[PDB]
Every structure is written in C-alpha cells, then in structure tokens.
Amino acid sequence: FEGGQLPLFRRIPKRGFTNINRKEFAIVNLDVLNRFEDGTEVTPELLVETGIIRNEKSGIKILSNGNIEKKLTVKANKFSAAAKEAIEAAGGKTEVI
Amino acid sequence: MHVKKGDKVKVITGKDKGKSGKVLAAFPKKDRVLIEGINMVKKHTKPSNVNPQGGILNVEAPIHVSNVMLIDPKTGEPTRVGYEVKGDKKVRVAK
RNA sequence: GACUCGGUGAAAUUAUAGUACCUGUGAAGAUGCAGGUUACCCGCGACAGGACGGAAAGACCCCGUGGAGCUUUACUGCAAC
RNA sequence: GGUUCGUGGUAGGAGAGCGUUCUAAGGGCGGUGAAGUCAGACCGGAAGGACUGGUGGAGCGCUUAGAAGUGAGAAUGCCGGUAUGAGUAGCGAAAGAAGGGUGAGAAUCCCUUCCACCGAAUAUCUAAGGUUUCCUGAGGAAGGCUCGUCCGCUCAGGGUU
RNA sequence: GGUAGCGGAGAAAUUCCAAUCGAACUUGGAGAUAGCUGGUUCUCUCCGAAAUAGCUUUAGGGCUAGCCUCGAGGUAAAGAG
RNA sequence: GCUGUACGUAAGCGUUGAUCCAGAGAUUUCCGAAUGGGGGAACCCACUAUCUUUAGUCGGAUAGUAUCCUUACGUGAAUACAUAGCGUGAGGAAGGCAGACCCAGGGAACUGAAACAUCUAAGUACCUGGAGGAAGAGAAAGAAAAAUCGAUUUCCUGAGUAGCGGCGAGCGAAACGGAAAGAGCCCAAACCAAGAAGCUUGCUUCUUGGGGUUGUAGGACACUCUAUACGGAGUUACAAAAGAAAGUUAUAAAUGAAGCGGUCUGGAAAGGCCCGCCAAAGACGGUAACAGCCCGGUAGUUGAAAUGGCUUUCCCUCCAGAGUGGAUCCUGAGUACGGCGGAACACGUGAAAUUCCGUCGGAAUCCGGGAGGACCAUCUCCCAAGGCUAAAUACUCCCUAGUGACCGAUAGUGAACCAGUACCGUGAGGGAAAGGUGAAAAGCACCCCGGAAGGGGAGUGAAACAGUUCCUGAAACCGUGUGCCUACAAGUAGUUAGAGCCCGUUAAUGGGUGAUAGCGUGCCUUUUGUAGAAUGAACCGGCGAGUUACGAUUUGUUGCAAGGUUAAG
C-alpha cells in the first residue's frame, strides 16, 4: 500500500502463460561422473541409487559444466551437445533413452 | 477401626504417652476414641437441668486412633494387630 | 427555614497546600514567578469578584474517504402492478 | 592493566542486568522459630540485596539453567476500603399541654382531663393488589430520618368455620 | 381483551408503543469497526533524529526517499577543513 | 456401634447381628408431552363399568375413556351397488436434551476492499427440521495417459501451486505419491410358477415365491456337470428373531511386610543425633509439627450371591455354483441431455467442461450409452438415471482411574460458602458479594461494673493482641501521649548553609527537630511551546495493556555439508 497512490504492480503489465505440458529435467553435471571407474555404465537408476538424484522430474539432462577425466558409457533422456562431445572425447559413448 | 469399645489400650504419642486405659467410646465418623484417664480436660459448665450445681469438671476427651495401640489381655503388653478366621468367624490376632 | 441548644446525620467536590494586593513577566488574562506593598493566631454569621469555580469528553464551528432519518427526473436495485 | 578521544538528551536503535511466579537438578535453614509483616543510622554504580530485633507460627531460600498471566502513578481505569466538605444541608405539609403510671432510663410508651384538626372526609364498607403485615405473650441488636419501655421490626405460639 | 418494531396506533406533534423512540427492550453475529482521543508497569550504559521532497478521494493518515541506530564489508582512502 | 447436614434434649434399635456398602425388586402424591374435559402449573369438573357404605340421598374404592398415522373388522350417506364418514380393536408416534459433534431447508449484516455497488465477511451467525452415537460419503457411467491404478473416508505432502478475481481486496484446489483403516453386497428388468382382477374378450396387468444383477460386457434362454445341507454363512451390510453354557470384565469387598527403638528440643514429634528393619509395598492422605515401619492404605495375591456388558462354544436360523454356446430377449424415460433462469464445484458466464434446483422441450437403449475442462474425430477408461454398507474421522452433558514448569479466593467456573441464589426488571433477560478459632470446644465455671451489650480478673489452652469474619492483619484513615519548633508572618512546602535543644546508631566524617539565610512555579499527557487559567487523577490497597498458533525474512548458535532434512504414520 502506498497511500492510495497506485501500487507498483498495478502500474505494470502482466506477462505470460504457464505451459501445462512443461518438461523440467533433473540437471546433472560432469563433475559427478568422475566418481565411477572407467568402462562402466551409468543410468538413471544408478544415479538415483547413488543419491546424486532423488527426483526424475520429467527426465534427466546432462550438462557440460565442468570436466570429466574418465571413459564412460552414459545413457539418459537428453544430453547437451557439449557434454556429449566431452563424453565422446574421453572415449565415452552416449545413448538416448 | 482397629480399636473397639471394651479394649485395653496403650497410648503411643501425645502428652499422655506411655499411659494406658480402656476404650469407653468410639467415633469412626471421625476416627477418635474416648479413653479413661487420657486427655482429661476441664469443662467450664454452667448449671443446667443436669450438672445443676455446675462447675469446672475434669472429664476425658477423645484422642485420635492412630495415637493408640491395643494390648493383649493375656500378656498385658502392646501388640500390633492382624486378622485371621477361626472356623467361620473373623477375629483379631496379636503379632 | 436560616441563628443558638440537644439528638441524628448525607452530598456534589477534592494533585499535595502554611492558599494577600498592585504592577509586570509568562502558552500573550497568576493565590503560588519577579519586584514592591500590606499582613499576629483560631474561628462565627452574612455576600458572591476570582479560583478562566462544580455539573455535562461543546449541542455553535471544523474535521472524519463516521452514522441515522427524509427527498428527488443522483446511481444501482427490490416488491407490487 | 595502560595511552588518546569522549561520557546532556526527546522519538527511537543497540547492549548489559535487577527483581517476581513456576519447574528440574544439586546443595541447604527452619518450632532452639519459615514465608509474611513492622522498625532501623548496613550494603551495592542502578533496578535492588543483607543483618538485627519485635509480631507471626509453617514452610522457604541459594546456585546453574529453563518457561512466563513478569515489575503500574495516571486509562472521566475496575472492585473494595477510608477520607474531604462536616458535626455541615436535611430530619418529608398539620397543635399540643400537663398530671398520674410503667420503667435502669421517658418530649416521644400507657391512662385521664382540657385543647386543637378532618368531617361528600383525615369517617364507614368493599373490589383489585399485597400476602400474615391480624391477635396474644416476651424483646429492643438492627430497621423507624430523633427517642423508645413502643411499632406494620424481631422471636415463639395462635387466629380465617 | 386486540393491534408489536422492514412493525403497530396516531382529531397529525417526529406524537406514543413500560421513566428508552427520525425507528423500543433484550440476547446473539460481536473482542463490529474506529487513519480518532486516552492509556501502555523495572534499571543503567552507548549512539541519537525529524517536523523536509514527491505521490496520494490526499492534507492531523500513509508509502518511498532524506535524516538515526546496529552489524558485516571493500579498497587506486574515496569523507571534512 | 447407630437414629444425616446438625448442635440440642427426649425416646429408642443393635453381635438372635443393626447403622453402613453393592445388586435386583416393590412403592413412586400432583404437575409437565400430560393424554377423560377444562385450565391462570403443580388446580378444578366428570362419564362409563364392577364393587362398597348409608334407612336412602350424599359419599367411597378399582379399571377404562386424548389426537393423529397405519392396519383389520363392523356399520354407513346423498346414490342404486359403492366410497366418504362413523365406531371398535392391534401396533406406532407425540416430548425433552450436551448452548457439543452432522445432514438438509432457509439465510443476514457489521466488516474488508483504506468510499462503494460486483466481490468479501459467508453459506459464517441465527431460525427450523431430521437424526445417530457418530453422521455424511461409498463399491467407478471413476482417476488418469506410450503405464496403468482398482470402493469411500481421514491425515502428510502437492501448495499458497494451478487457477478464480472491479484480475482489485482477496478466494484458492485436485490428482499422482506416502500412511491410518479396510469389505463387500442387494434389488429392477427380461424368464418360470401361483393367485386375483379385466374377459385388454384367448391377450393383458396387478400381488407374492424363484431367477438375476454387469462392461474382456453380464444376465435371461439352451444345454452339460456339481448341489438339497456334503460343506458354508449369520443378526456390523450381505435375511431375521430368540436361547443356553463357559470364561472375562464392571458395579460391594478381603488379606496385606517392617521401630510404641533410645535420647534432644518441645504444647505435641512425623523433625535433629545414634541404632535397626521391610520393600513386587519410599503412591496419596491423615495423625497435636516434615511418618515406608501410627492409621487408612499402596505393591502383590484373592474374591461377587445378583444384575449388566463383551469374547468363545453350542443351539437356532438360512444358504445352487462352475462351464460352453450365444436363435432371440432384458439391462433403472418424461430421465439423460438441450434452451431459459439461478446455484454448487477453488472456478464471479467467463472458451465453461462436471453436479444440482425450477420451467419449457425431449433421446439411443448394446453395430447402444457416458467421460477424458467448449467442441469435433480417433484412442483409452467406464455403464448413469435404484438401494445398503462397518473401520479409520468429529465432539463430550456424563462414569472410572489419573496427569499438569494450570489458578490458588479481585485468581480459578458467574458460583470453593445452600448461586443462576439474593437483587434488578412487566417480561425475555441481566446478575453479584461472601472462604480460614483451635490439635482437640477443652467455646471463658465463679467474682466485680452494668438493665443488656461490652468489659476487667480468674480459668481452659502452647497461645484468647486465637473468644464464635475467630490464621497472618499492610496502607489510606481515626486517635491518646510525648522529645523539638511555631501567634510581625505569607511562598509547589523542600533543598543547601545552620545555631540551639534533645537522643545515642547495623559507629559513621551519627540520628530527630529545626530559629534564621540562600535558591526554587508538582507529576502525567499532549504540544512549536504547559507551573500552567489545557487534560487526567480524592486517597490507599489490589487487578489492569505487544501475547500465542501458523507462515515469510534476517541475525546469532549448534549439527551435517553439495548436500541437508524427514511429515503423517
């Protein structure tokens, strides 16, 4: 309240809409994936069992924030281009679930 | 009441401690006993239809039952009491 | 009635009070401050200038995005026709 | 423990504490006298805390923590008590007097006599209403605007065919 | 005996409806709401304002800023004379 | 031992077993729904039957007699059969509360939006009706989505999200998920049988029995196999009403260890000191003061004639269920939907799905029908218009046992006391105040003043400065007495200097008083500013104002740390 002066929110406009089929994905980085011995297989179930993840919100997504040092096969719902590149460059491989 | 009219009695506590006497009355509505020679007390009595002479009278007053202990009429010494059944008649027992 | 005697015995009020006057100052109208002037202590009956006296959170005035009652071609409605 | 600069303060911010009620634990005093209360010329920088003595006559402190119905001088505050005015206003329309008597006590009660008041009423009946206030015998705490030996007051017995 | 409150009665005055009537009394919603007044209880120590701008169906209210306090920061020490 | 609180005197009963306690019975005036009729509450007046008294009237007992609903039966009109109506009998209800919880009908405003009307407050308060111990809801015409789940309810979350909204103030879910608790069933209809009513006249159309109840559709109807009590189920739904027995529990009770230990204080010992003891018992309370060992009792162990409940057993009662076909037939009609008008769903007509009410219209009915937030198609899920259903949930006038960092008599219930009283009011209705002798009445014999009250002694008691508002007994307030000052003086009343006089202390550069001298316009509030001729307070005492729940944010602390933490349960 501002004394009958028009409030800030009433002097500016509404914006947008909430989508109903919105998909938000659990965000995994590369730094975590150094925890595993090379040549093994990473999965959603494994990442939950290890407590890295609790909520598979609408899926998993692996982002290239950081670095890996280790060869790995990874499988998830969506990857970023850069993280795919880094995984391959370490000799890893990628599957899309 | 563990003490009854007609009993012989020892006094545990009080100013009249160590003394003994008979039980002349009992009041279980108040847990008091009226005992001879114990708690004698001076009543300032105006004359009336009885005690028409009036005066200061020494008479016994009641004292509490817990201040009192029973005596076995055979030993003559004071005894805490239990209860047993003789035949089909409950009784009082010394111990 | 009031006044004195005898009996009985309230009230409104009340910050504490050993409660003068003039002139002045001061929230601009002082029993209470200043400076001067008067004034031994305690009461009784009478008067009412002041205590901006008592009573009644001014009824005048203004304010409140307070209220009630009334009016109408104010607005929106309702019954009834 | 030192040096330098400071140390008026409303609204208001910040901090450190005093004290009350209760709880837990530890450790205590207290019928050879607790809390409380009364008086004191003691203590601490403050809120406040001890000591002594009297009264009281059975419970209460201290320590460290914790929790709060937490500390009043004002609200034309609320309830209770007591003042002030103040021995004041008032004692509620009216004619009483004296003698005898009762009685601890009499303007006030009872009796007598004179006097005075109402008299289309201040009389006699009776509804409504009130509900024992009627009668008798005792009584005088309170009530009665004084008084009281009296009462429509208090007690106890009766009384309405 | 009848008429009862969004009502009734009025030879009509806002008159009367149990000492209340421009809309009874009581109980409840109800601790109505009150930008209004009043009040708000112990101590010390440090610091210490404002009564301005702007906007406001706003003017004795409020909001933001200016002014106070407390804490933490950061340095190419920026403040003051 | 007893004849209550409740003293008293009188008179009496009790071990040939009282008073008392528990269970079941009996009796239970009059009023009140109040019911034989009336009625101004607790009053009045009756009738019909049988009996009784009187010489007979008069009078007395006992039983029945309300209204409505349903049901039979009998009478019975206009009107002719008949129905209405009337009467009788068998059942049933009526009314009250616990100011609580829930279901429906009806339904505000104050307030908030810093006006206000949509909106909010709020489907709240209130009225009314129905109830029941819970109610309501409920066994998918569901929730959902590349995967399915399997009745309802309640809780945690989702989430203050999605969204609604003068898109303002504000209103605000649901599902998934996780838990408590768990349970599933019955009709209708086709179809068979009987009966009656129409003769719908060889067809219906109503009352009962069987049959059957559902979605990959199920059933009737055809067959096979079983089945007639083999076995199973049950009064908590699935049908309903009874009975016994056993055990357990509740409503009375019983038994129950150990110090009269010594000594000190003391009015009194339960306390101090020194010795012991018991403990499945050191709960509580009482007792002349603080008791495990004094009393009642507690732990423990026992027990109930009678009645009530629960759990089991028996009796009793009652019980066709699988399969394959699928000619045909059935599957909730004036509903389901739609229009109009309103409402409930978080959803304010908004694009407005879903549910409900009123009124208009008005389907298909299995190659059918609904929903998936307008709507269309496809897909998926599901069968409405009929009914029942425990448990988990909500509340507490009550009973039993118990608890409190709850009150402790201006508190705590309004009410610790004869309080919903006194009192106020015509009434509805409002509504107080008021606790404490003592361990024990031992409650002051007797004397004196006095008419009494009240005192002073005496005496009781530890104590009467504990004496019938009686533990303690503050302050305002009223007084008695006295050490110092005061009748030439004004002064917010004190302070500072200070003589003289008087005392002697928590002993310290002390106390009380103050001639006289200097200075000095209360407190609070609100104000630019108040001694203020502005406000408030008579005084004294008590009570009397930032708190709690949930959430946001920040600071500090602690723990773990790219981890941390669990909620319900």
Ligand SMILES: [K+]
């Ligand atoms: K005057």
Ligand SMILES: [K+]
């Ligand atoms: K003392």
Ligand SMILES: [K+]
């Ligand atoms: K009235």
Ligand SMILES: [K+]
């Ligand atoms: K039900």
Ligand SMILES: [K+]
């Ligand atoms: K005890």
Ligand SMILES: [K+]
């Ligand atoms: K709609």
Ligand SMILES: [K+]
């Ligand atoms: K569905």
Ligand SMILES: [Mg+2]
């Ligand atoms: Mg504006």
Ligand SMILES: [Mg+2]
């Ligand atoms: Mg005069």
Ligand SMILES: [Mg+2]
């Ligand atoms: Mg005014």
Ligand SMILES: [Mg+2]
């Ligand atoms: Mg300062």
Ligand SMILES: [Mg+2]
């Ligand atoms: Mg308080």
Ligand SMILES: [Mg+2]
């Ligand atoms: Mg005068």
Ligand SMILES: [Mg+2]
């Ligand atoms: Mg006079």
Ligand SMILES: [Mg+2]
């Ligand atoms: Mg005349």
Ligand SMILES: [Mg+2]
């Ligand atoms: Mg008389």
